[PDB]
Amino acid sequence: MDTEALANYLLRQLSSSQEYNKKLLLACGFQAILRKILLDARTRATAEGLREVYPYHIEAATQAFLDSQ
Amino acid sequence: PYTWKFLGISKQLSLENGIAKLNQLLNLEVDLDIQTIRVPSDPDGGTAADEYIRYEMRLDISNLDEGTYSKFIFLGNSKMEVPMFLCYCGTDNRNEVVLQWLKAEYGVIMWPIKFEQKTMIKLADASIVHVTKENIEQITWFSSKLYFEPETQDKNLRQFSIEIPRESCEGLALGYGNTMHPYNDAIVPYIYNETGMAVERLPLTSVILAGHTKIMRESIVTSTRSLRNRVLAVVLQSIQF
Amino acid sequence: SIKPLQIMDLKHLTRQFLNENRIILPKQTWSTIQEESLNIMDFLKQKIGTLQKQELVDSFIDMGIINNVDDMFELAHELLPLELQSRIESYL
Amino acid sequence: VLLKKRIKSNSWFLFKHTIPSFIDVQGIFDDTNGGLVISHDDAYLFAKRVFLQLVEVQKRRQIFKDLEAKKIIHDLDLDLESSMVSFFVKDIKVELFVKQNEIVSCSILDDIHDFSQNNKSKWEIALLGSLDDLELKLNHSFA
Amino acid sequence: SLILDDIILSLTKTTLSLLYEKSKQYGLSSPQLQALVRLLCETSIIDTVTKVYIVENCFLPDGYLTKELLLEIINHLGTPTVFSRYRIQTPPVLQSALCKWLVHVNISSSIWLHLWQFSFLQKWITPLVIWQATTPVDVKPWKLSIIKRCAMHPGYRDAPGSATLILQRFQCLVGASSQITESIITINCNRKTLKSHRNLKLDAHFLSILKRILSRAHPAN
Amino acid sequence: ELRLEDNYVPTSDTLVVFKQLMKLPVTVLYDLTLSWFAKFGGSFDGDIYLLTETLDLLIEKGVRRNVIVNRILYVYWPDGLNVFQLAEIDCHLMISKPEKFKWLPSKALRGDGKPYVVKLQPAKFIENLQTDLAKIYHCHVYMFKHPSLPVLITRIQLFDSNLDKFQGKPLISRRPYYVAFPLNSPIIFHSVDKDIYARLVLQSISRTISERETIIFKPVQKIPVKSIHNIMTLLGPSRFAESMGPWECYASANFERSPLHDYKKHQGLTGKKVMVREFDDSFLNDGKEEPEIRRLRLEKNMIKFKGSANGVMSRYSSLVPIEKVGFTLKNEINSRIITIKLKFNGNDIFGGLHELCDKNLINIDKVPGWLAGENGSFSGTIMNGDFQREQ
Amino acid sequence: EWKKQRKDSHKEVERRRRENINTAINVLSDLLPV
Amino acid sequence: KQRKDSHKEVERRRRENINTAINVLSDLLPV
DNA sequence: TAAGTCACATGGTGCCGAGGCCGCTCA
DNA sequence: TGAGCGGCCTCGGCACCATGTGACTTA
């Protein structure tokens, strides 16, 4: 499932070429949010020592992220 | 968990000369070690021409895992039809470069080694007899597990194993008597007498010594960092013509 | 339903990122991030409703992700195929 | 039924048997001489005790099959030991739970508008007893 | 035959049918194939379904494929970038079908590897870069780095399994270029997508058509 | 009121039911449609005889089963299938494909310890089970007799409770739990499930069977076996129970006839052809042996592993295929307990061992009883030469 | 290495301890009725 | 925040069960 | 300092339901 | 040519023993 499929998801959520580029940049930003959140989740899991992450880890990470945003 | 792949060598190659060429080719110094072991020290296993030459080539860079610790072990005896075999652990890509250099420098013919059923039984016999610094041999008992994968029609019997605990194995050995090959003389005849299975005829894929090693038909993987002299010797008599 | 994404969509989306950088996700974490994708999309649409040139890069600077347009088409480099990042570079 | 000698006690044990599970041959064998059996007399006693059960099931099935053969009752269903049965006399579904050569339970199921319930209970009480008595009284009440 | 390039110069419905039947009877020469692909790529008045029907039914070589045909094809497999906007974008389905037709039939290895970074081409570039790698000296750590970087890259579909196939071929080929099986471990571990990638279909009807055309072509060649 | 009647409609996915009816043949679909419309009716309008004529036109039109599946899922019952339909289709799938289901046996011990030969009054048993399980969960139970086997198979289905999920008003079903009742046998076969609902169903079944003295189900085996016919051959009330492997000749009685029979055809008069078996160890020492004595040693292996010279009838397939057995042989060699744990795996353990014996890999003169298939599908410890099963 | 040899010796000691535990468990099971 | 029902948490439970069995066995012993 | 006991955290073998593609396969 | 059942088989979740190493104690 490519990034263009996520752009299709976003356009069907909101419903030419320049708006396609805008939505593609939006999909890239969404992937950046997910990657940063998962990186914070691993950082906190390694801080606690657990090999995997858990829902409370990533909930705390995303609350700390949205606190700054 | 260090798997040893075994390859025979058609010629008695001398490694104390020409290894500087390998050092120059690999841009790193290898730690070649020379030993002269005499494996069948028991009187019933032979008393003459027992000396072997053991080379331990080691691509030494760092010591964290087998990615920088792909050892090479060579064994040789000039009084045999086939005079040399090698076995190497690890998974580094430099090992096949070493094998290619060994071929192209010494002109040797190298083939992979496959173990038969009696060869695997003899290897399980060899891998418990441990040599001590006081020059004595100690049989360390391990709870073996003979593991078979028969091929039957309609896949009727895919696999079956025979688990033998440690104290039962030493009880069988003491029941047979003072012997230095417990599996071939006590364990396997007891299995044949009880269950009717001749394990030297059945397709035997691995015998697993719990916590020490588990040898297979094409590879030997050992928890111990090295391979003892008895296993190397039994492999050397295995490939004879 | 129609607006929430599926679990297999998230596997296909971020499976390689959890593989190159070693991440282990149990099923509870997968369901949690499936729930979180909706919140992230709502927050992104609340922050950026309509799309024009300067406001998106200003918001992404405010997002704390980037510092310039160089970071924009370098982050697009690591998240897009070659034709799409070339098209984005022609757009920026 | 095949009995093998125990290696350490010199007594027979229930090795293999070809008798179905509604006859507790292991319980009968353990009941014979209080567990262990040695002499051939105890083995013959266990054999007779289980052969009586075989006679019971065969005789019960024979009586019910003869009831079917004489056309006194309509189509019936037999289980494996012929204990839980059901049959029609004219159209009344009479189902019986019968123990060894003696009916211990009865149930008249089919209801006719002319048919009552106190006469039904009286018939159910009267139908109890032996199997030959059941055949005789059922042929008596059929006429 | 001369009918084929006569129809080609005429194109510079009836002509399409004549070209189809003369390809099914004779097959085009390498300059004829060059002219045909040059006419097909540059213009866009021809329908795309007819374009893929041509590249799957009309391109039938007779002898050796010359290097100039490959160089002309490579010129058409590019994409418009910030340094080249005058040339029009070749349709991606046409590029994929042309690469599939290439599957049907040291510099060039890097040429095909740098074209492997295209997402839509990955389903047919991989047999070409497998078949190009015939010697242990061909592989290099920069090739491995590019393959791993594009494999673990998101936004792709065929990259994990196909690039795992490429790395498996490289591991089976060189036995050097220090160990890359853990790189295979980092890429997908499903044994299903590359299982479907490791067996590929070449439209055996077209294979039989080319077989009969080539049997009609040169003796002892 | 918490018991579930035979007219409630649950929320079932239409695609799962669509692919579920694909496996059934056309004639059972025909019989099911007429039975369903005779009992419950449907959204389709017409007489029962008119619908019979319509299905008749369908079956001499030779139409595929896909069209009639779409009909019965889209016009006959478009709102949803009733619980009786959902149980009866799955029971018909069980009848059509018995090899896709695994069963676990459990003896019905009672009181002192003597097994209880369970006998069922089916309608009263279903009513009592539904009233007992209605106190805990939303239960629907359906019971039928096998067309071939003498069993009574029940099907217990349990229903549970129920970003903004909009509205469904559902009753989500779980996987059904099957408990098979043979006619007269203490052994009870039930489906393979170890969650709390399976324990609840077995507990309620034990409480509702008894009604006179408390009954507990003790599991006699932990390794599931497929194909309900095979588990009736093994654990059911048949002659083949407790006579397996080399002793299937006694369970089939092919070697002796009645004492009222011809005494010219007796076994002792006509005799049987055998070979001298060498008690000296000569198997390990040893090509193109005589084809008559080769047939005799093949017959010897066949007799040892299947009980009969010709077998119970490729040819290695036993009466019941066994998937997993594990034997723990223990001996006493000079006051030392010596244990050997043999574990097996495959589609047919003793057929594969028979094939290995035919290939001269296992000595047929030294293969013990428990290895030969005696007390089959039972895994246990062999102490003092006596096999006691595990628990 | 020195520390690697120490780790191997401690590994062997722990393996011997685990084998002794398993042997004692097997002996206790041999004395068991069932 | 105790949603951990995986490894390092179920092996700990099994080890604690084995330890409690060993403890009650030693409690039944005179010494 | 060599050896031992300990819980601990990760490695690993076996198992199975779900589901997918394959592998002919037959009309 | 086209739908179609069955062995394969791998995903992965679970279950259990197996295992190597640091912390700590003993001599």
Numbering used by the authors:
A (entry chain W): 1 to 15, 36 to 89
B (entry chain L): 2 to 242
C (entry chain T): 269 to 360
D (entry chain O): 222 to 364
E (entry chain I): 2 to 13, 25 to 117, 130 to 245
F (entry chain N): 4 to 165, 186 to 309, 315 to 341, 374 to 451
G (entry chain B): 218 to 251
H (entry chain A): 221 to 251
Copy out sentences from the published article reporting this entry, exactly as the authors wrote them:
Inset: CENP-LN, CENP-IHead, and CENP-TW form a basic, closed chamber that topologically entraps DNA. Specifically, a basic surface on CENP-IHead forms extensive contacts with the DNA-phosphate backbone. This topologically enclosed DNA binding chamber is further stabilized through interactions between an acidic patch on CENP-TW with the CBF1A protomer. One consequence of CBF1 engaging CCAN is that the CENP-LN channel is extended, so a total of 25 bp of DNA interact with CBF1:CCAN. In addition, the CENP-LN channel converts into an enclosed basic chamber that completely surrounds the DNA duplex, a configuration notably reminiscent of how human CCAN grips the linker DNA of an α-satellite-CENP-ANuc. CBF1 then contacts CDEI through basic residues of the bHLH, with His227, Glu231, and Arg235 of both CBF1 basic α helices recognizing bases of the near-palindromic CDEI motif, gtCAC[A/G]TG, in a sequence-specific manner. Notably, CBF1 binds to the CDEI motif in a manner that is identical to E-box (CACGTG) recognition by the metazoan heterodimeric bHLH Myc-Max transcription factor, using the same conserved amino acid triplet. Last, the CBF1 basic helices adopt an asymmetric dimer conformation to accommodate the CCAN structure, most apparent for subunit CBF1A where the N-terminal basic α helix is unwound by nearly three turns to contact CENP-TW.
The point centromere of budding yeast specifies assembly of the large kinetochore complex to mediate chromatid segregation.
